Design a protein around this ligand. Structure first.
Ligand SMILES: C[As](C)(=O)[O-]
Ligand SMILES: C[As](C)(=O)[O-]
Ligand SMILES: [Zn+2]
Ligand SMILES: [Zn+2]
Ligand SMILES: [Zn+2]
Ligand SMILES: [Zn+2]
Lengths: 330, 331
C-alpha cells in the first residue's frame, strides 16, 4: 500500500495531493462515446473542454481527481489518459458497475464479476494496461438481486487487492445501511468503503451512525442545486432544491461530531453527460461555472469562514483521500 | 442501388450470391468484447472460431452473411472486418437498436436516433468508415414507447438511404403486425422490411397476411430446436421443441401459397453469446454443429426432397436477398 495507480501509471501517496475523490470526465454509457461522438460535438471538443476544466482545477490547487466512471457509465480510459497528460492532473480510474449494466453483465455470477473487477484492477482496462485504483458500485433504494452480487464482488475484489470501494446511493432511502450490511457479510472493513452522495440527505443521524462504524462518508454533491431553476423539472429532479451551503454544512456537522477523518468531499462534476436529457450539460455549467474548482474555490473558504481550522481542511482534502486510496490489505 | 455495403467495402449485387440474412459473429453488449474478451476465452480464440465457421459455411456455398448485430448487441465492426477478410465471406454490418439499449440511447428522441442510424449508414460505424447495409430493430410483444421511436427512426433512415430494415419479433405475439403499422405510418414500403424470427409461430395466416402486404418474412430460426433438452431449462427456453423440419416446412407453406418472393431464410447463428447464461454456446453447438452451414447443408436439400424446385430455392437464397439488400429509394 505505497503506490496509487493512475491512468499515467503508479504515483506515490504523497504525489496525490489535494484530491477530488468522486468526479467524471464524461458520464455516458458503454460504447457510446466511440459510436456517437457527435453527441458531444466531437471527441476532440469533449477532450478540449475536459482539459480546460482540469487545467482550471489544477490552477485552484487540485492535484488528483478520481474518475469513478465504471464500464456502464461509458468510461473511456484512453480519453482519461489523454486529458490527464494534456492537463497535467493525475486521474485514478475505476472498475465496478453502476446502475445501467447491459445483459452481458446482468446475467453474470458473483464469481464472474469478481474476475472482471480483478482484471481491471490487476491487469488493466481493455487492452491499455491502465489499472483501476478504486471500485464503484451503486444502488437506488433497496438493492436488486444483481446489485447484491455486484457489492459482494466489489468486496471480494477489494479484499484481494486493497483497492477501496466507493458507492452511489439514494441517500433519502438510506442505501448506505444495506450497502454496509452486504459489504460486512463479505468481511470487508468499513474503512475500505466510501458511502457516496451522502449530502443528498439532511438525516445527520444516518450519517454519523455510519461514520461511527468506520465508513467514509462521501459528501460529493456540494454544487448540485436547481435553486433558481425550479421550473426546469428535469434539472430539479437531477439536482435537488437544497442549496450548496446547506450541503456544505453537513461537512461541518460531521466535523463537529468528531468524524473529520471519515469525510471525503467532491463535486461529482463532468464534462459530458449522455445518460440524461439532451443539453443537460449546459444547464449544469450555468449552475456551477467553477465546475471541479468549486470545492477549492467556494467550499473550503466557506468552511474556513464558519471556523473550520486549516488543519482540518488539509486532513479532509489531502490526508483522508491518501489513506482511502492507498491500497490496504486486511 | 448498384452496390451493397460490406465490412470490406461496396460489392455489386451479383457478388452477393448465396446470402444468409440474419446471423451474428458474436451476440454480446456494447463495449463488452473489448472490456472482457476472456469471457470468450480470448478475442483471438473467438476470431479463430468464427473464421473456421465462416470457412465451413463458405465451403457449403455461402457467399455473404448479414450480421444483424446492433450497437447494443455489442457489434464490433473491426472484428467483422477481420473475420470477413480471413474467411473470405462478405459480411454486411447493421445499424439500429435491439432490446438492450443503454441509458444514453433510451433517452434519445426519434430525431436523434434517426441521426445516429444515418451516421452508421452514410458515414461509418465508430471511426472505421465501415458503413451499415441494414437496420435491425426489435420488439418483444407490444412495442415499448422507446421501441416506437426506434422503429420510426429506422423507417426514416431507410426512406432516406434505401437500406432495408429487419426485425426481431416475438412471433407468437404477432409483433409483426404492430411493427408493420409503425413502418407504414412513416411511409416505408413493406418491400423494405423483413419481419424476423417468423418461424417461431405456427400461425400460417399471420405470416401469409404480412407476405400479401409485401413484407419479407424472415424464417431465420430453423436450427433453433431445443429437442431432447428439457433437462436444460434456459436452453429449451432459448430454443423450443418444434422440430427444425417443422420450421423448414413453413418455408414450403409460404412457397405453396404463392409467396416465394417474400421469403428470407437464415440460421440466426453465432460464435459467441455473452448476453445469455454462461456456456450456452456449448449447448447450442452440440444441438447444431453445422452452425451457419445448417441452411445450405440440411434445409435446402430437405426442401428439394419435399418437391421444391431448384429455381425456387435459388430465388429464395440468392434473388430475394439481393433485392432486399440493394438500396432502394421510394418512387
Ligand atoms: C455517474 As452519476 C450521474 O450517478 O454521478
Ligand atoms: C441477438 As438474438 C439472441 O435476438 O438473435
Ligand atoms: Zn452517482
Ligand atoms: Zn458520479
Ligand atoms: Zn432476435
Ligand atoms: Zn439474431
Amino acid at each position: 500500500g505505497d503506490r496509487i495507480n493512475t491512468v499515467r501509471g503508479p504515483i506515490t501517496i504523497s504525489e496525490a495531493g489535494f484530491t477530488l475523490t468522486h468526479e467524471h470526465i464524461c458520464a455516458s454509457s458503454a460504447g457510446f462515446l466511440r459510436a456517437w461522438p457527435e453527441f458531444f460535438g466531437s471527441r476532440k471538443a469533449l477532450a478540449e473542454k475536459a482539459v480546460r476544466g482540469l487545467r482550471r482545477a489544477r490552477a485552484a490547487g487540485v492535484r488528483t481527481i478520481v474518475d469513478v466512471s465504471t464500464f456502464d457509465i461509458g468510461r473511456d480510459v484512453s480519453l482519461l489518459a489523454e486529458v490527464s497528460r494534456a492537463a497535467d492532473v493525475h486521474i485514478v480510474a475505476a472498475t465496478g458497475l453502476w446502475f445501467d449494466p447491459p445483459l452481458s453483465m446482468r446475467l453474470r455470477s458473483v464469481e464472474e464479476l469478481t474476475q472482471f473487477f480483478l482484471r481491471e484492477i490487476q491487469y488493466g482496462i481493455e487492452d491499455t494496461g491502465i489499472r483501476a485504483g478504486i471500485i464503484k458500485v451503486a444502488t437506488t433504494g433497496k438493492a436488486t438481486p444483481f446489485q447484491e452480487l455486484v457489492l459482494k464482488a466489489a468486496a471480494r475484489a477489494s479484499l484481494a487487492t486493497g483497492v477501496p470501494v466507493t458507492t452511489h446511493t439514494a441517500a433519502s432511502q438510506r442505501d448506505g445501511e444495506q450497502q454496509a450490511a452486504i459489504f460486512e457479510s463479505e468481511g470487508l472493513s468499513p474503512s475500505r468503503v466510501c458511502i457516496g452522495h451522502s449530502d443528498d440527505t439532511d438525516d445527520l443521524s444516518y450519517l454519523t451512525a455510519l461514520a461511527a462504524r468506520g465508513y467514509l462518508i462521501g459528501l460529493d454533491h456540494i454544487p448540485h442545486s436547481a435553486i433558481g431553476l425550479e421550473d426546469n423539472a428535469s434539472a430539479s429532479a437531477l439536482l435537488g432544491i437544497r442549496s450548496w451551503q446547506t450541503r456544505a454544512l453537513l461537512i461541518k456537522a460531521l466535523i463537529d461530531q468528531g468524524y473529520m477523518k471519515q469525510i471525503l468531499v467532491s463535486n461529482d462534476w463532468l464534462f459530458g453527460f449522455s445518460s440524461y436529457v439532451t443539453n443537460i450539460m449546459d444547464v449544469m455549467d450555468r449552475v456551477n461555472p467553477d465546475g471541479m474548482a468549486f470545492i477549492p474555490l467556494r467550499v473550503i473558504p466557506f468552511l474556513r469562514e464558519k471556523g473550520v481550522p486549516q488543519e482540518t481542511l488539509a486532513g479532509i482534502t489531502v490526508t483522508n483521500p491518501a489513506r482511502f486510496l492507498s491500497p490496504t490489505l486486511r
